[PDB]
């Protein structure tokens, strides 16, 4: 059991204890988001066309 | 210093924020108006508490925090509550209409409307930091805002602050307190979309916390207030070395395996008049005891990749080492072959703090352990199975498609979780 | 936040009036709009149903003036906005086609102006609830015409109905199955959540359980108003579960077309001992307490909301609710985990210390649609009484479509029950 | 009523427990994948232990111990004996064994082969005890129930699975005289039915023929092996404090040498029972392992807290 990196101060201390050795761009985001908007818009238009009928 | 900005998203994120920021103030002697008599450097400072609190010329200590929710109910309580003077109005951001327990409304429909505003308010806080280290993001998996808006925000934060760490505190869904049949869906969708953006995530299973409150605090039917106060002790121990004087390259040796198991001891009730005081050995032992974990899983049947322990209170390194020695020759603490079998240990001498009129007794000494174990995959397996049951019938899927998601996002998110489960299994069996 | 309430036709306006009487009392609003209560919980979410002293956000519609005088002079008639009374002179004569296509078409734009006005001053309108029968002409035919128009102007808002379904045991007319089938067709396409309030069930409760040898509409409506109070508790008081219409929809409706709920209530009354939490729980799930006349044991529960009102152990509620799922687990579909949610509100209803309201999405609701469908075909196959509908411009084909969509609805319910 | 599910259609033993439970009137069988169960009778491969104990309002119990496969695979059993200090390299009742991989010095490979040349290579027991008449080999099967409290219950009936062939020192290629498997026997049925000699007879033979008893000469050792093996893995598999509870039925397999010493050969995680003893044992599984946890003797309790 080897106790390494011992650091001490007034409010606390720290150490290790070894027992044993061994993204999308902004443009892609805005695109994705806008495609979802486009699909909701389509769906809405589809319903209003059917209600117009 | 190394500043940290906290972002509290959705009901769960916000209410946990209330508990944590209340606790930090009590630990640092900051009053509810933001005054801190002990701070002798007025206007600014380079102290450890300054990682979490900026300072005004008037002697006021202001959280480096934004609270975001898509409806105003929960944040209105912060605006009118006991800590209302602590936050500048612009840190408290609300829309008018929530995500209705739907990731897709959170992410796409309602989310798009408020995202640029939130990033600007974050940018204002970022512009006050001399050397910003990163973000702590608090949210539910199961809410529409907690899931959907959080994943949108994390994507944008990688773009705008690529060089910066992002840690999560994420509330995993439990049927005793959950509010929506679709929480598994929301949990997988958000996990999928956030995975590559988050450096480390601390999951708190509401079931684990609920049972700890019932079993150790004698609370018949725990409230969010009960749950959140216990959560805040874990959060406080995890952030303590930042906020006080002391010392993911420790906890995260594989990018995707970044969900460490938190365990906390001792949790003892206030109403317990006669309470015998637990030693260092006893509390260290309790850390390897499944009933004190923040997620109920069995670490004996996985493998360890790292353990970090933070002790608070009357603790000296000799008793820590002795307790650790005895632990090895008693439990099943098997580490992976490529990691050292060993424990990083922090000790903060300040005894732990309790909110007056809380449920937790004030103890002489406490410990929080974070251990990256393959056992936590048990939580993914459970959630994935629920998701499969509903998704096979496409139950509730129309709510998502109606907001503009494709079915494909479901099966792609699920296949990432299948791959995640595969990854955990290889490292741990 | 805001709900806009619409009541149409005789039935619509009678149960609607009763709803406003009951909830005004629960919220401490007297008939002059003034507040006199002793709990801040009564006013906290008052704005969901009332504008600001407090005026209901309620629109009252009929093609016949008779009903609108009798509401206007009834107990709380003073409290309604007078401009929100919109009425024709002609009536609909229990004829769906009159309500939907000829006479109702004349009145409907006026109703929409009143809706638009109420809507326009909502901070964030959630959607609409309508009360109506499906057996008559105005509630059925004009009410469904309204729903369709409202959806055109408010396509992203939730449409909720309380739809009184007809029965020969409490029957105004033989053409009721025609009118109901035509309306169900509309409801399947155009509402998000429909509470199926079955006069067959209400009669049977009054007769068999409550021991009333000749039930009046008053008696049937005493059950309807307790139910409406119960199922709207989570909208009107502070709470986590199903606190708005969209969240309810998301929890209750796994597939868009299967949005017809079977409400239940305990204890049934027309009360010296409060029930125990176990008795409430057993009773609220009992066939005899359902307001739709279906045996839940002939199907499976997709989703269930359970709302408990009164001062009681929340532990005991949780234990009893777990108890009933654990012991009847085959009657809950296994492919929707944790499909039963439970709310508890402290404030009980008038005259009870303890009460339970049940909202079930069961596949057994197919029994209701089949009964209507049986009565429909019996007449339609001899084209009986059709000329009253073709004389208003309708085609046989439109009946054929409606019967088809309803038989389809039945099939789907059956499909998920076998899954 | 209590609820159970059934995930091993092939299990002789738990096919009988399910039947015994149902004829009580206080146990309903649910569908295979319905999670609202009190009791899982699990599958043998990849049992989903991580989904147990997360149903509020249900105490859940399963008929396997997660981790017990360490005892019940030949590879892993050898590794456990060798590396547990409770057992050790010096352990005097396991045969000298070796884990080895693909791609009198008499040994056995475990399709099985026996030679003096060259997944586990183990010292073959020459000089086994041979029953008479017939100069013939046997093994002993003991059935052990470990309950949710970790009580170790040895069923008082065990069985000798016999050879029907004279035993042959100079011919290890021929099996049946060397391998005592019920299947791989089927000169069968000559001395006793199905090559199964039960304890009353074998005790009698030991008395009449060797002037000792089954208890003294064999069972103290059986009992010692079983408690040693199971008290060894207890910290790793116990469900004390865990959020579901486990029990399990084990088949322990023993060779007796000519000096009436006992040897452990194999531990078996999913044993079958001998036909005559199904009813008795299966009842005791209900009495001691199930109704103990869900209320409405044939076992020896292995316990021995000696002082040093
Ligand atoms: N521990 C804890 N869990 C909470 C709290 N509030 C909600 N939850 C849990 O979080 C999930 C619900 O998500 P919320 O955070 O309430 O939802 P939201 O982010 O406001 O999302 P929407 O209302 O859908 O816009 C459920 O699992 C709840 O049990 C809290 O204060 N503490
Ligand atoms: N070291 C040894 N010395 C003598 N006989 C041995 C032996 N190893 C194995 N055997 C013989 O082989 C037979 C079966 O061996 P083993 O127990 O390894 O296989 P197995 O897994 O098929 C038994 P089971 O069907 O109960 O699981 C035993 O009954 C025994 O007679
Ligand atoms: N429960 C209940 N049913 C009613 C009431 N009034 C009418 N009905 C039923 O409603 C149907 C007749 O509809 P009605 O509302 O009179 O027609 P409308 O005025 O044209 O909408 C029949 O099935 C009646 O049984 C009522 O007050 N309560
Ligand atoms: Ca300072
Ligand atoms: Ca006209
Ligand atoms: Mg919310
Ligand atoms: Mg009428």
Numbering used by the authors:
A (entry chain E): 6 to 27, 44 to 74
B (entry chain A): 1 to 247, 256 to 437
C (entry chain B): 2 to 53, 58 to 275, 280 to 428
D (entry chain F): 1 to 103, 144 to 150, 159 to 166, 180 to 247, 252 to 361, 373 to 384
Give verbatim excerpts from the published study on this entry.
The α, β-tubulin heterodimer reversibly assembles into protofilaments of microtubules. Crystals of the α, β-tubulin heterodimer (T2), the stathmin-like protein RB3 (R) and tubulin tyrosine ligase (TTL) were prepared following published procedures.
Over 20 crystals soaked with pironetin for times ranging from 1 to 24 h were screened and one crystal soaked for 3 h gave high-quality data that we were able to process to a resolution of 2.6 Å. The Fo–Fc difference electron density of the soaked crystals unambiguously identifies a covalent adduct at Cys316 of α2-tubulin (subunit C). The binding site is entirely contained within α2-tubulin subunit. Cys316 is found on β-strand S8 (we have followed the published nomenclature of tubulin secondary structure elements) and the pironetin molecule adopts an extended conformation that is perpendicular to the antiparallel β-sheet (strands S7, S8, S9 and S10). The lactone ring of pironetin sits in a pocket formed by the residues from the antiparallel β-sheet. At the secondary structural level there is a pronounced shift in the position of loop T7 (residues Phe244 to Leu259): the Cα atom of Val250 has moved over 11 Å, whilst Leu252 has shifted over 6 Å and Gly246 by 8 Å. The movement is a direct consequence of pironetin binding, as in the apo structure this part of the T7 loop occupies the same volume as the pironetin hydroxyl alkyl chain. However, Glu254 in this complex lacks the link to Mg2+ due to a movement of 4 Å of the carboxylate group.
